Design an enzyme around this catalytic site. Structure first.
Site, PDB file in Angstrom:
ATOM      1  N   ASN A  71       0.840  -1.187   0.000  1.00 10.43           N
ATOM      2  CA  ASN A  71       0.000   0.000   0.000  1.00 10.43           C
ATOM      3  C   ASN A  71       0.881   1.245   0.000  1.00 10.43           C
ATOM      4  O   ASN A  71       1.647   1.474   0.946  1.00 10.43           O
ATOM      5  CB  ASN A  71      -0.942  -0.011   1.207  1.00 10.43           C
ATOM      6  N   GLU A  72       0.761   2.053  -1.049  1.00  3.84           N
ATOM      7  CA  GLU A  72       1.502   3.317  -1.152  1.00  3.84           C
ATOM      8  C   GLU A  72       2.993   3.090  -0.937  1.00  3.84           C
ATOM      9  O   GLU A  72       3.666   3.839  -0.223  1.00  3.84           O
ATOM     10  CB  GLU A  72       0.955   4.353  -0.171  1.00  3.84           C
ATOM     11  N   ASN A  95      -5.527   5.116  -4.284  1.00  2.15           N
ATOM     12  CA  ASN A  95      -5.929   5.914  -3.126  1.00  2.15           C
ATOM     13  C   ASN A  95      -5.898   7.382  -3.540  1.00  2.15           C
ATOM     14  O   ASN A  95      -4.816   7.969  -3.662  1.00  2.15           O
ATOM     15  CB  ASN A  95      -4.990   5.694  -1.937  1.00  2.15           C
ATOM     16  N   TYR A 104      -6.480  16.474  -0.371  1.00  6.06           N
ATOM     17  CA  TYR A 104      -5.038  16.711  -0.312  1.00  6.06           C
ATOM     18  C   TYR A 104      -4.516  17.515  -1.497  1.00  6.06           C
ATOM     19  O   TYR A 104      -3.481  18.166  -1.369  1.00  6.06           O
ATOM     20  CB  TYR A 104      -4.267  15.394  -0.231  1.00  6.06           C
ATOM     21  N   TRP A 140     -12.247   5.825   2.723  1.00  4.22           N
ATOM     22  CA  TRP A 140     -11.307   5.930   3.830  1.00  4.22           C
ATOM     23  C   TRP A 140     -11.905   6.942   4.794  1.00  4.22           C
ATOM     24  O   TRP A 140     -11.863   8.142   4.512  1.00  4.22           O
ATOM     25  CB  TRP A 140      -9.941   6.410   3.343  1.00  4.22           C
ATOM     26  N   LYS A 158     -11.182  11.005   9.891  1.00  8.01           N
ATOM     27  CA  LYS A 158     -11.543  10.627   8.529  1.00  8.01           C
ATOM     28  C   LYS A 158     -12.773   9.729   8.450  1.00  8.01           C
ATOM     29  O   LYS A 158     -13.193   9.367   7.341  1.00  8.01           O
ATOM     30  CB  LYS A 158     -10.357   9.926   7.850  1.00  8.01           C
TER      31      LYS A 158
END
Ligand SMILES: [Ca+2]
Ligand SMILES: [Ca+2]
Ligand SMILES: [Ca+2]
Ligand SMILES: [Ca+2]
Ligand code: NA
Ligand code: NA
Lengths: 827, 853
Positions: free
Chosen positions: A389-390, A455, A461, A535, A546
């Site tokens: 993930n990321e 994501n 962001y 998320w 969140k």
């Protein structure tokens, strides 16, 4: 009888300060009594990462012919187990179960002692290496004592059940089921056994029965494959209709059962298509749901099975049909509920943010992948396995010399893991969650799994909401053969913050609602996007607002938005579950009414709003929302979607008007267009207003924006609840005015310098009131420090019809102001 | 003149600091804090470690202050518990003893001229035998838990060194409807090296626009001198009288000038009233007999310790006013000025005392410290018209049962002679207020005559809770009135505890249910309302409050609040509102409950029995169910009640059909069938339900098994010391203490006539302390009792647990939750049996859930 399993959670002692508890030790003074699940990081969230010791005495007389295991559902991050002074087992990896064989170490007397050394400090070779969620330490999942015979389904196959079910052929009218058994014989004699395999809906009905003979040599083990061909008369499993079966497996010696273990079974076939997305049992469906973290403030990750069920229930009542288990494998209860409730599941191991080059990190990562797949192999809800993930997020922070080598190690590890999934489980898809960073393009990493997950956070962001469709349309355009899935999308929200002018990153409820509405809509408009997971299900503890629901699981507006967007039942309900107060500062002397924008979440064509049970108006629903613009008399009012509803209590609201000309019988959040409603004492801080003659407000200045977003996002030191007040501010205001009658007022100015760091002589200014000097000099950066709030409180007596004029006197740099409150007092 | 600003920002705190006297720039290992602050906000809660840190904590701060010619600078500390030593730029600048009164520190001799200043405060909340409170039923939160102010004056000023009082003392030696006399006593100071001729302006004001009286007085003070000057405003006219019902307020503005220029100025509250307490009829104010009814208030709020904002003080007192209260006792200590200003403004007669609780230490150091504290309380709060009673001891003989016999005689004489000295000081300092003392149900006070010393005899009484039955309260007080026809009687405390998760149709004392608290409160309040010789009563207590040493249902929390710790009203608050308010009151009870679950008592059962109540001062009220009329009920002593039998599902309750301004109460009502299928959770050993809020899990009150149904088989509910269950802190769990604490002793097992299937089964079990004890929080480790309580568990003849040694493997107060799955076959139902080996099995709770496999 065959297999016995009971809970082993009670009677433990815990100490954070023990040097060594290997040897049996009756001492308990200074130890904490605990009942598992336990984490030692439930409250200190830096938080303690290090060794913690658990110990327990228990009675267990070993009987002839029996074997005794402990099953640990989860210890973060490494565990060493000692029984009666001897090393009995170790485990690395904080998210997968493991078994410990007690039998070699038990005392014939029955008096037993166990200690567990748990450690959650950082290890370069054990992911997660870094992430924005807390690495709570300890035995945070239950522990079980398992008794079996000396012939049993294996306890040593990566913590899995030793029974692995596959459905290589499934149609509506029949299926083939193969069951692969790992069997162990612990006796010193060869043994002839029988194995009974039954496919059941319940205890009274079986769909297939098979009987298999097997003989195992002394101290032996063996793998046997059983096939039930052409099973019939089952219902198909889908999220909508989660028809569940199970496989009863009975291992028998001399007709007496010696082990037994049931495992879940669902009948389904599925696939992903680049143009149209997910198909299950021939039907194209949209996968829409949520990520879910396994933590709940103030309990850390030491959650009860009741809490797991409550969470997943909330997701199902949302209309969700898709569950991503955040970044790690989760508890069996979670997967059992997904099977039962109906979620397709994405589950991954926690390689997050970065990779450690070398074969130790490769080995630990490989073992963790096999543990996850083997331990959750049989859950029909699982459709996707993932493992990174990321994985490039931390590149920004690394020395640029390492980047080439990290990319090479990332590509090489991803290919090893992809190969392992495909070999262990040919009937599920592989995926990876990527994020908005050019390294994925440049390294081709997204070519390795079967599914490209993204994501994405456009309008939160970076960018604006519509950049989301632009981004995904461009991926579809570059990769018409990829399968696209939004593994994360969401915005934050504090249920104390409200704005009629929401804006990016202000944490208002309304901003989260608008973000959620836009992205979900853009996903629904695009068949090629196989699905999306918000998320995150709930506010969680991180590094985090969140969630669609609060930390204690109460739904926010956005939850009800998704329920209106996703549910197949009819839906119509008022918004603002966490708000009952509206305050408006009049904009002219002739104002008499409070403007109140109300909204409802619905999947109907239209909805009607009632005020005090009288019709206000009908409104058209678009994209899950209806909206009304009300101007109300100050007072209390009842709102509702039907007149005098026979089963739904009205919502009571409280709306107030502050006169244009104030008398202070006045709280303002400066530098922001949102209100902050402080829940401790019901204190309503108004959105900012510029002063004009005859009224009150801030004079001069510019709103603070940092990185293109309103205010600073840094943690305000020394205060917990008031951060959204302090974090927004005007820079270089001249002061603050209020045309108050003569009298005495308590005045508060809230101020803080933005990025303990001390910056002396950088931001210094004085404050005066009607020519009277109050504070000759405030050195915000110098005497207080960056992010250290300064709250100037004092009383002043207004005289001679002068009104109230608060003035800033620059000395160095520019003044700042975060909030103002003015109260009339008697003296 | 006078400038005052908050001084709460920019401090650094460390609990592990050896010494921060010397200016020191480092911040590593220091916590940034904004006063008010206490270091005991969290470690007093259920944190796995009985006790909390009492010891030294250090504060430090750098600040800018350029000292101006002709100015003096002070810090005013509104409160630091317990002792404080202040150091400015490395030099000792002041110290204080006592955690509940304010103190001033003159900064001026220690300030750097160039303006860069350093201050450190050494605070300490260790026990000190010479400084009360010595022991008490509340937490001794350490730190600078009240705000600090920076005060600037001229070199001639109202004194800063008069026991922390304002140096301005207002008395009304004559109050009449046609006129009053006000005397203002001023303590002045001159820090100049020259004599000064000053003027002093005294103005009585309603507001900045209206003066009732004006005086202009010449004062000359010698160099480095000080003086006291009395100003008299005779025959002031045109004021309104102060009373709790009509709290008309005024103030005295005072300006000190040198050649006409202001060097100091300070306003102080002023209200006009006369009052008296009568032995037979009670309290009179401005000629009108009124009943004082209100509450005690502690200055804490979980989870913030006692570091409260002024907003929180105002919220607490507004709640009391909205309850219909007109009477406030500040628990055992003097409180913040904000509390007193709000009592003046809202209207409460106030009782305020210093914290001599439980015991007295023999000796002149204890005598001295308590004497000073008394002068500080009276002087600091002198001017508040809301105060009518000063006090100085609370249950002063309580700790005697625990003291060595050889200490008793000297303790008794130390108590007697200290009470006489404190009584004398009050009367000398303040002839215009009453003295009182709070006593408790113990014969010591009668034997020693201590109750004859104050003018008012206060009783903390708990009939139907700690002793006796409710009606013994009136017997007790009637005997007191007969024995002492000259005394003034006031109920300084009464209350019972409740957890808002505990409900019963058969309430009983110490089950901590909501209903038992309501019944206790209703009975004592109406017994008080029936007795004019009882001048007043104060509930114990307004809100649940921190008392770390407590056990019971919720360790560390005294649950006798009318409201919860976060200030939400329980039923008993609304009962008090219905009994006290002059406004019309009518509203449904059960603010913290929306769920009712009933186990069917027979196979034909179809309805859930629901007893509903409402609080009202009207003659009658009507309950409506889904907006149809259910029935009109007569109100008796603040309550109406209805017995419903409802179909399972969601229902609306209301006191009007289709109210246009009141949302209905929505309730959720469910029936567990007589024969279960587990699609089932029981609190064994208790008649109350436990509704676990974390997950909305409702544990039914216990029900004995009968054929064809489900329940516990055999056994007896546990009682220890006359109270249901054990009151010990159940270790390792927090929320579930009241579930574990009740249990059946020696049960045979549990039964459930369930269909064939697989079920998850949970048995909750704990070995208990057999004898009650005063303080159950001092155990050093776990008490193990091996071989004493040993048994096996089987299910339908299958052995689940061959043997469990409860006392030996777990220990006293250590919970044991036995969880497993069993598959019922062959139409057998579910039969769980205990097999005694030594002693008797125990069982606190059972839960059974159908699972798929
Ligand atoms: Ca209604
Ligand atoms: Ca903060
Ligand atoms: Ca503690
Ligand atoms: Ca406990
Ligand atoms: Na702000
Ligand atoms: Na119980």
């Amino acid at each position: 009888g065959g297999r016995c399993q009971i809970a082993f959670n009670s009677g433990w002692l815990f100490s954070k300060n023990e040097a060594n508890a290997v040897l049996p030790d009756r001492t308990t003074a200074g130890w904490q009594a605990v009942q598992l699940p336990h984490t030692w990081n439930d409250k200190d969230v830096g938080y303690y990462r290090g060794v913690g010791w658990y110990k327990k005495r228990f009675r267990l007389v070993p009987e002839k012919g029996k074997r005794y295991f402990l099953r640990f559902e989860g210890v973060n991050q490494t565990a060493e187990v000692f029984v009666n002074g001897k090393p009995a087992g170790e485990h690395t990896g904080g998210y997968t179960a493991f078994n410990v064989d007690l039998t070699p170490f038990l005392e014939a007397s029955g008096e037993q002692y166990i200690a567990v050394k748990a450690d959650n400090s950082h290890r370069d070779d054990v992911p997660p290496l870094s992430a924005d969620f807390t690495f709570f330490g300890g035995i945070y999942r239950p522990v079980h004592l398992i008794t079996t015979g000396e012939q049993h389904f294996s306890m040593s196959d990566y913590g899995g059940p030793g029974i692995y079910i596959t459905t290589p052929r499934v149609t509506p009218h029949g299926a083939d089921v193969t069951i692969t058994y790992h069997l162990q014989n612990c006796s010193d004699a060869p043994q002839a056994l029988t194995l009974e395999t039954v496919i059941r809906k319940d205890v009274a009905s079986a769909l297939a029965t098979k009987n298999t003979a097997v003989t195992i040599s002394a101290f032996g083990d063996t793998v046997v494959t059983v096939t039930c061909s052409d099973v019939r008369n089952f219902d198909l499993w889908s999220p909508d209709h989660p028809a569940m079966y199970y496989v009863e497996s009975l291992l028998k010696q001399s007709g007496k059962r010696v082990d037994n273990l049931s495992q879940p079974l669902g009948f389904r076939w599925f696939r992903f298509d680049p143009e149209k997305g997910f198909f299950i049992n021939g039907k194209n469906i949209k996968l829409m749901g949520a990520n879910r973290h396994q933590d709940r403030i103030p309990y850390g990750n030491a959650l009860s099975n009741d809490m797991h069920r409550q969470d997943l229930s909330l997701l199902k009542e949302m209309g969700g049909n898709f569950l991503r288990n955040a970044h790690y494998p989760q508890a069996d209860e979670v997967l059992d509920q997904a099977d039962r409730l109906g979620f397709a599941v994405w589950e991954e191991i926690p390689l997050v943010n970065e990779v450690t080059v070398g074969p130790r990190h490769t080995e630990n990562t490989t073992v963790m992948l096999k543990e996850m797949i083997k331990q959750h192999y049989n859950h029909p809800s699982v459709v996707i396995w993932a493992y990174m993930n990321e994985i490039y997020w931390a590149h920004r922070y690394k020395p640029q010399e390492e980047i080439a080598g990290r990319n090479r190690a990332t590509l090489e590890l991803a290919r090893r893991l992809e190969h392992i999934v495909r070999e262990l489980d040919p009937y599920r898809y592989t995926a990876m969650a990527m994020h908005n960073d050019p390294a994925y393009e440049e390294t081709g990493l997204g070519d390795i799994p079967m599914i490209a997950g993204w994501n994405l956070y456009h309008g939160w962001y970076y960018g604006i909401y519509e950049d989301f469709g632009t981004f995904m349309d461009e991926q579809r355009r570059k990769y018409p053969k990829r399968i696209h899935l939004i593994s994360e999308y969401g915005a934050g929200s504090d249920v104390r913050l409200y704005s009629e002018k929401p804006e990016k990153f202000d944490f208002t409820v309304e901003e989260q609602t608008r973000f959620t509405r836009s992205i979900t809509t853009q996903i629904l408009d695009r068949p090629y996007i196989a699905g999306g997971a918000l998320w995150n299900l709930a506010d969680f503890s991180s590094e985090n607002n969140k969630g669609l629901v609060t930390a204690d699981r109460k739904p926010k507006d956005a939850y009800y938005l998704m329920q209106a967007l996703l549910s197949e039942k009819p839906v119509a309900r008022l918004g603002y579950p966490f708000r009952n107060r509206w305050v408006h500062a009049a904009t002219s002397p002739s104002d008499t009414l409070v403007p109140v924008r109300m909204h409802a979440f619905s999947n109907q064509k239209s909805v009607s709003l009632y005020v005090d049970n009288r019709l206000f108006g009908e409104a058209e629903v678009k994209d899950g929302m209806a909206e009304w613009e009300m101007k109300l008399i100050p007072g209390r009012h009842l709102l509702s979607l039907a007149p005098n509803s026979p089963d739904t209590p009205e919502k009571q609201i409280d709306v107030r008007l502050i006169p244009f000309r104030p008398d202070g019988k006045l709280a303002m959040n400066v530098g922001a267009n949102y209100a902050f409603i402080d829940t401790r004492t019901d204190l309503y801080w108004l959105p900012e207003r510029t002063y004009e003659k005859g009224s009150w407000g801030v004079v001069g200045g510019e709103p603070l924006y940092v990185g293109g977003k309103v205010g600073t996002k840094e943690d305000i030191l020394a205060v917990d609840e008031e951060d959204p007040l302090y974090q927004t501010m005007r820079v270089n205001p001249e002061g603050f005015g209020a045309d108050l009658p003569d009298g005495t007022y308590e005045i508060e100015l809230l101020m803080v310098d933005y990025v303990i760091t001390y910056e002396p002589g950088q931001r210094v200014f004085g404050v005066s009131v009607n020519g009277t000097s109050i504070l000759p000099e405030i050195d915000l950066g110098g005497s207080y420090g960056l992010n250290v709030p300064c709250r100037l409180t004092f009383r002043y007596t207004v005289t001679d019809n002068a009104g109230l004029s608060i003035k800033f006197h620059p000395v160095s740099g520019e003044p700042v102001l975060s909030a103002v409150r003015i109260r009339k007092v008697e003296f």
